[PDB]
Amino acid sequence: SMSVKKPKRDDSKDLALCSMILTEMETHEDAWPFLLPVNLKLVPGYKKVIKKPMDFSTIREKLSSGQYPNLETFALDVRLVFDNCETFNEDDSDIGRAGHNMRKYFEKKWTDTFK
């Protein structure tokens, strides 16, 4: 509270470390459904159903331009990618399986790096 602070967790490497994680996600063979924004002109249903589209290119731009105030807002956008994928895709589709695999991959990197 006012003039009573918890000890300072060192966040100075967070930007670099999120950049590294995102590089690993971008280069994963199952990243292909997630590399660019879904083309809202060509994919019926997507615009109306998915209220907050997100993709790895958009996260990379946000990260590069100081649009994440902290590592939790970064993790929110990553998880939004996989949440959207589950919303729109059957578990037993290639894209659906891709999304589950990438979520698993992310979450392990996240835990190993920060937790």
UniProtKB/Swiss-Prot annotation:
Subcellular location: Nucleus
Tissues in which the protein is found: Expressed at varying levels in several tissues, whereas a smaller transcript was expressed specifically in testis.
Location of the Bromo domain: 9-113
Entry superkingdom: Eukaryota
Function: Regulatory subunit of the ATP-dependent BRF-1 and BRF-5 ISWI chromatin remodeling complexes, which form ordered nucleosome arrays on chromatin and facilitate access to DNA during DNA-templated processes such as DNA replication, transcription, and repair. Both complexes regulate the spacing of nucleosomes along the chromatin and have the ability to slide mononucleosomes to the center of a DNA template. The BRF-1 ISWI chromatin remodeling complex has a lower ATP hydrolysis rate than the BRF-5 ISWI chromatin remodeling complex.
Family the entry assigns: Belongs to the WAL family.
Oligomer status and interactors: Component of the BRF-1 ISWI chromatin remodeling complex, at least composed of SMARCA1 and BAZ2B, which regulates the spacing of histone octamers on the DNA template to facilitate access to DNA. Within the BRF-1 ISWI chromatin remodeling complex interacts with SMARCA1; the interaction is direct. Component of the BRF-5 ISWI chromatin remodeling complex, at least composed of SMARCA5/SNF2H and BAZ2B, which regulates the spacing of histone octamers on the DNA template to facilitate access to DNA.
Record-given protein name: Bromodomain adjacent to zinc finger domain protein 2B
Recorded name of the encoding gene: BAZ2B
